[PDB]
Design a protein around this ligand. Structure first.
Ligand SMILES: CN1C[C@@H]2CN3C(=O)CCN3[C@@H]2c2ccccc21
Length: 282
């Protein structure tokens, strides 16, 4: 069923809450035993948001390999994403260790550091060229190279140095700065423009490690970003673009991380984004 007609049918009927609860009920439940170990309590932002054991990213260290991060591997679309929480004061060094070890080119940030008057993640990147950051626990140096501030997003060039080997890599920081404190954007135009800027950078392409995507919990806004990207790629690849079933793609993604798309309004916004993005391309 063409999703645009499914969309009008749900809107006229006002059944978004009913569709969303059906997804919550059918979603996968896998163990997260490593996330719940007492040694890892200060590595988790939210007691109810944990990576499954089968899909968690492992840090390359013998001490403690744990980070709150999952690999989402989309077999038919040939895309992979790492979805992670906003870094905490005790995990900013682990975060950049993961970017280094996974060979990521891009970090996608969909929150502000402060929202609703509370801290939603650590200030984990440098704000001035001449004031670099050193992470002593993981032996990394991070330098701000350049910053391009636009109306709806900021792009940063960062230099990450492995102090152990003196190798360096260029990391691109894509910061969507205008998601509202409450609800979802009224139009998906600026979110789709942003998605197209990340794609154009190479950050989502198979010559690099998976993109790292976060918000505060790494399931809601982060879920919307990967869901819209995969659905549009499948509409490009298949003979019948009308066969793409957004609810089935979301349930496949929830095999790899719990809770992706946190509200019925985020589910409606994801449909709007895919419908408008399809027509822009097709
Ligand atoms: C270089 N650097 C940055 C890291 C990142 N970091 C946080 O985000 C919370 C505090 N802690 C560190 C810290 C502390 C004192 C002086 C310098 C630095």
């Amino acid at each position: 069923m063409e999703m645009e007609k499914e969309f009008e049918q749900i809107d006229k009927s006002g059944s978004w809450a009913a569709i969303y609860q059906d997804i919550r009920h059918e979603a996968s439940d896998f163990p997260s035993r490593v996330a719940k170990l007492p040694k890892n309590k200060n590595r988790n932002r939210y007691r109810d948001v944990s990576p499954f054991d089968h899909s968690r990213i492992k840090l390359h260290q013998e001490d403690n390999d744990y980070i709150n991060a999952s690999l989402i591997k989309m077999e038919e679309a040939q895309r992979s994403y790492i979805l992670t929480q906003g870094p905490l004061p005790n995990t900013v060094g682990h975060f950049w260790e993961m970017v280094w070890e996974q060979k990521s080119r891009g970090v996608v940030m969909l929150n502000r550091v402060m929202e609703k008057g509370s801290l939603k993640c650590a200030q984990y990147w440098p704000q001035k060229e001449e004031k670099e950051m050193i992470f002593e626990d993981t032996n990394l140096k991070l330098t701000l190279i350049s910053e391009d501030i636009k109306s709806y997003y900021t792009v940063r060039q960062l230099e990450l140095e492995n102090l152990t080997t003196q190798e360096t890599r260029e990391i691109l920081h894509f910061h969507y700065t205008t998601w509202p404190d409450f609800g979802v954007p009224e139009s998906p135009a600026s979110f789709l423009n942003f998605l197209f800027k990340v794609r154009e950078s190479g950050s989502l392409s198979p010559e690099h490690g998976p993109v790292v995507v976060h918000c505060s919990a790494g399931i809601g806004r982060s879920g919307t970003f990967c869901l819209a990207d995969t659905c549009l790629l499948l509409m490009d690849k298949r003979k019948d673009p009308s066969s793409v079933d957004i609810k089935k793609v979301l349930l496949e993604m929830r095999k790899f991380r719990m809770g992706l798309i946190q509200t019925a309004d985020q589910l409606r916004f994801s449909y709007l984004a895919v419908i408008e993005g399809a027509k822009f391309i097709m």
